[PDB]
């Protein structure tokens, strides 16, 4: 198994990067000694007026409807060209 | 609004028949708020070539052309299988994009004009419209286009709005969507079809001589009519284009009137009679054959022999991907067959067809038809085609031009 | 073949030459004969006519009839409407 595991792939580290990206993306900036200082602000903001309306804005996006059709038509053209 | 000084001081219109100065010109915009507007001018069926020329290249700010192509087909009776339609639009995109072409049609939202405009919108989304906008110029009758109430105005209407109706289309027709220019024509009548033909052919000849005095030699830009299938009007516009010597009509090998000429074009001119064409009209126009007058049959059966009289302007092709045959092959063959039998002795048969055969990847036709063994060449003639083949990554034309007489010592001198 | 040669020369003008022979040519795997003899280039088609043969070819795992009926005029937007 060890030889099969070590000789399996070179893309393991690249896959790991993505595992790091999510949790260290979402977490607030200030370190865990002072994380309660961020919790006070983010907890006070949470119940008064809705904060961070896009929870994830660099991963998941909702395209405008006028753009969507022009976007899909381009990749259908590229599919036939492929 | 600087064009408005000229466009109410040169171009007239027709009424009552007497003529008067025109109105109702501007820029139409369709339903999408941001879909790019066009430019419409009515010109009532009889105008000077100089005034139309000044409208064409000066007051619309429109650059010189490289290849004019014209598409004629059936409207309101046009049926084609999905396979042939798909192959035709895929070929027509590549024809219309590799060269800086102009494409011309009778733009109304009915049939073959719809199938041209949808391929043009598919490419302009596929291109992203960065620069070099494709010009798809349309010519339609003023009288038979409908719901012009929001369009007729005596002072100009630049953000002119227009909506597609698609309901009241019994004796009138709806205007198309995917064009950019519009020349509407008016004969003083409000119901008759088929007025546009004469100014369409005269506009083809007018565009054909635009590239003269611009460069070193007097070579005119090529024109090509591509006919798919259509009824009594399409045969009329084919004949009216072929009266002019330069246009070359290229026919699809699948349709109804295209199958008529595809079956007539085998026999000699003496063989064809009025019984044979009557037999073929019963055979191909299965429905609506009855509605035809015998006198109208007598008119077609003279039109068809006048089309068959000149055999070096008539070419039937058949699209098949197995035998490596497409629309560009047909355009290039029908363009080479015309020039070889002409008044000129030489030096113009090859000059503008070589760069067009290099821009497309059609090496096989090029070698036999242009590099005939009875020809003689010099490297200083073949330098620009060598540069054009070498930049755009076509190694086979490099291999062929290298051994037909391009010296590298002369080329990089 | 002997069933298609009879019906084409008959008293009726049309609309019965193909209706019961198409489903029988789809139940058997005989695509090659079907295309030339029934899908003549001088014919015209509509997807609402070819829906039941499309269903019968699609259930019984015949991909070639799917490929042929798809390009002779069956629209998927009309079929799964
Ligand atoms: N320019 C037109 N636009 C829309 N509909 C038309 C047009 N011309 C004719 N029609 C309608 O279509 C019917 C005939 O259709 P076809 O015979 O298939 O087309 P055809 O008459 O040959 O006209 C072909 C059209 O294309 C252009 O090349 C040319 O400007 C001509 O008008 C007629 O009943 C007529 O009402």
Distance of CA B15 to the CA centre of its chain: 30
CB neighbour list of residue B49: distance below 8 Å, 6 or more residues apart? B202, B206
Residues B342, B371: contact at Cβ < 8 Å? no
CB contact under 8 A, A74 and B122: no
Q: What are phi and psi of B18, to 5 degrees?
A: -110, 165
At residue C44, the 3 state secondary structure works out as: coil
B395: exposed, middle or buried (Cβ count in 10 Å: 0-12, 13-18, 19+): exposed
Give the nearest chain C residue to B255 (CA atoms). C42
3-state SS string for A38-59: HHHHHHHHHHHCCCCCCCCCCC
Nearest to B384 by CA among B361, B335, B350: B350
How near does any CA of chain B get to the CA of A60, in Å?
A: 24
Point out the ligand 1 atom lying closest to the alpha carbon of residue B76: 12
Tell how strand B12-14 and strand B157-161 pair up.
unpaired
Rounded Cα gap, residues A66 and B253, in angstroms: 40
Rounded Cα gap, residues B271 and A62, in angstroms: 68
CB neighbour list of residue C79: distance below 8 Å, 6 or more residues apart? C47, C51, C54
| Residue B124, Ramachandran bin (φ over 0: left; ψ between -120 and 50: alpha; else beta) | alpha
At residue C50, the 3 state secondary structure works out as: helix
Residues B315, B251: contact at Cβ < 8 Å? yes
DSSP letters spanning B223-237: EEEEE---SHHHHHH
Please check whether residue A72 touches B, CB under 8 A.
no
C-beta of B339 in contact with ligand 1 (< 6 A)? no
Residues B249, B255: contact at Cβ < 8 Å? no
CA B113–ligand 1 middle distance (angstroms): 11
At residue B357, the 3 state secondary structure works out as: helix
What's the DSSP call for residue B221? P
Rounded Cα gap, residues B136 and B74, in angstroms: 18
CB neighbour list of residue B405: distance below 8 Å, 6 or more residues apart? B377, B378, B379, B382
Q: Which of A70, A77, A82 to mutate to test the interface with B (most CBs of B within 10 A)?
A: A77
Rounded Cα gap, residues C73 and B18, in angstroms: 51
At residue B359, the 3 state secondary structure works out as: helix
Please, which experimental method was used? cryo-EM
CB neighbour list of residue B299: distance below 8 Å, 6 or more residues apart? none
DSSP letters spanning B71-129: EE--SSS----HHHHHHHHHHHHHHHHHS--EEEE--SSSTHHHHHHHHHHHHHHHH--
Output b/e per residue, B164-173; b: 16+ Cβ within 10 A. Answer: eeeeeeeebb
Residues B186, B145: contact at Cβ < 8 Å? no
Residues C74, C47: contact at Cβ < 8 Å? yes
Output b/e per residue, B70-91; b: 16+ Cβ within 10 A. Answer: bbbbbbeebebbeebeebbbbb
Residues B143, B156: contact at Cβ < 8 Å? no
CB neighbour list of residue C55: distance below 8 Å, 6 or more residues apart? none
Pair of tokens at residue B330: 């047909």
CB neighbour list of residue B119: distance below 8 Å, 6 or more residues apart? B89, B92, B93, B96
C-beta of B232 in contact with ligand 1 (< 6 A)? yes
Rounded Cα gap, residues B366 and B2, in angstroms: 47
Please check whether residue A74 touches B, CB under 8 A.
yes
Residues B84, B142: contact at Cβ < 8 Å? no
Name B19's bridge partners: B14
Mutate to test the pocket of ligand 1, among B73, B75, B199 (most ligand atoms within 8 A of CB): B75
Rounded Cα gap, residues B32 and B199, in angstroms: 31
CB contact under 8 A, C73 and B81: yes
Residues B196, B237: contact at Cβ < 8 Å? no
Residues B273, B251: contact at Cβ < 8 Å? no
C-beta of B146 in contact with ligand 1 (< 6 A)? no
* Cβ neighbours of C41 in B, within 8 Å: 254
Rounded Cα gap, residues B2 and A27, in angstroms: 60
Residue holding tokens 């698609």? B166
* Cβ neighbours of A77 in B, within 8 Å: 122, 125-126
Nearest to B397 by CA among B368, B369, B362: B362
CB contact under 8 A, B34 and A66: yes
Nearest to B135 by CA among B71, B189, B72, B178: B178
Resolution of this model in Å is: 3.3
Closest-CA residue, ligand 1 atom 36, reads B171
C-beta of B100 in contact with ligand 1 (< 6 A)? no
Pair of tokens at residue B143: 């009288």
Residue B333's alpha-carbon distances to B71, B267, B313, B330, B352, in angstroms, are: 17, 21, 11, 5, 14
Nearest to B251 by CA among B311, B321, B201: B311
Cα three-residue angle B82-B85-B87, rounded to 5 degrees? 110
Nearest to A21 by CA among A58, A47, A70: A58
């Amino acid at each position: 198994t060890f030889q099969e595991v070590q000789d399996n792939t070179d893309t393991i580290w690249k896959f790991q990067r993505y595992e790091l990206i999510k949790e260290y993306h979402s977490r607030p900036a200030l370190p865990p000694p002072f994380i309660l200082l961020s919790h006070l602000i983010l907890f006070i903001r949470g119940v008064f007026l809705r904060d961070l309306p896009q929870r994830h804005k660099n991963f998941r996006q909702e395209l405008e409807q006028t753009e969507e059709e022009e976007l899909l038509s381009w990749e259908a053209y590229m599919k036939d060209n492929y | 609004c600087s064009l408005a000084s000229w466009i109410k001081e040169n171009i007239k219109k027709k009424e009552c028949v007497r003529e008067t100065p025109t109105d109702a010109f501007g820029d139409i915009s369709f339903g999408g708020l941001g879909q790019k507007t066009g430019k419409y001018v009515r010109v009532s069926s009889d105008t000077s070539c100089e005034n139309l020329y000044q409208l064409m290249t000066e007051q619309w700010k429109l650059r010189s052309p490289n290849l004019l192509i014209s598409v004629t087909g059936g409207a309101k009776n046009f049926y084609i299988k999905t396979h042939l339609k798909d192959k035709f639009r895929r070929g027509l995109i590549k024809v219309a994009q590799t060269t800086g072409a102009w494409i011309l049609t009778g733009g109304t939202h009915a049939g073959v004009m719809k199938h041209v405009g949808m391929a043009v919108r598919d490419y302009t989304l596929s291109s992203g419209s960065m620069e070099g906008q494709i010009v798809v110029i349309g010519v339609a009758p003023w009288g038979v286009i409908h719901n012009r109430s929001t369009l007729i105005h005596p002072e100009g209407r630049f953000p002119a709005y227009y909506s597609l109706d698609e309901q009241g289309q019994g004796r009138l027709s709806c205007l198309d969507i995917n064009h950019t220019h519009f020349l509407l024509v008016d004969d003083g009548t409000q119901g008759h079809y088929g007025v546009e033909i004469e100014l369409r052919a005269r506009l083809e000849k007018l565009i054909s001589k635009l590239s003269l005095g611009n460069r070193e030699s007097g070579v005119t830009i090529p024109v090509v009519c591509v006919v798919l299938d259509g009824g009594p009007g399409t045969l009329n516009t084919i004949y009216n284009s072929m009266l002019n010597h330069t246009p070359c009509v290229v026919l699809e090998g699948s349709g109804r009137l295209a199958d008529v000429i595809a079956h007539v074009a085998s026999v000699p001119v003496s063989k064809v009679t009025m019984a044979l064409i009557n037999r073929l009209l019963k055979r191909f126009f299965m429905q609506e054959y009855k509605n035809f007058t015998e006198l109208q049959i007598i008119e077609w059966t003279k039109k068809i022999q006048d089309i068959l009289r000149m055999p070096h302007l008539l070419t039937v092709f058949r699209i098949d991907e197995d035998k490596n045959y497409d629309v560009d092959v047909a355009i290039l063959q029908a363009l080479l067959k015309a020039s070889r039998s002409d008044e000129h002795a030489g030096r113009h048969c090859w000059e503008r067809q070589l760069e067009l055969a290099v821009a497309w990847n059609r090496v096989d036709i090029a070698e036999s038809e242009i590099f005939t063994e009875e020809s003689q060449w010099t490297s200083s003639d073949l330098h620009p085609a060598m540069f054009s083949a070498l930049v755009g990554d076509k190694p086979e034309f490099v291999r062929l031009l290298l051994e037909n007489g391009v010296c590298v010592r002369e080329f990089l001198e």
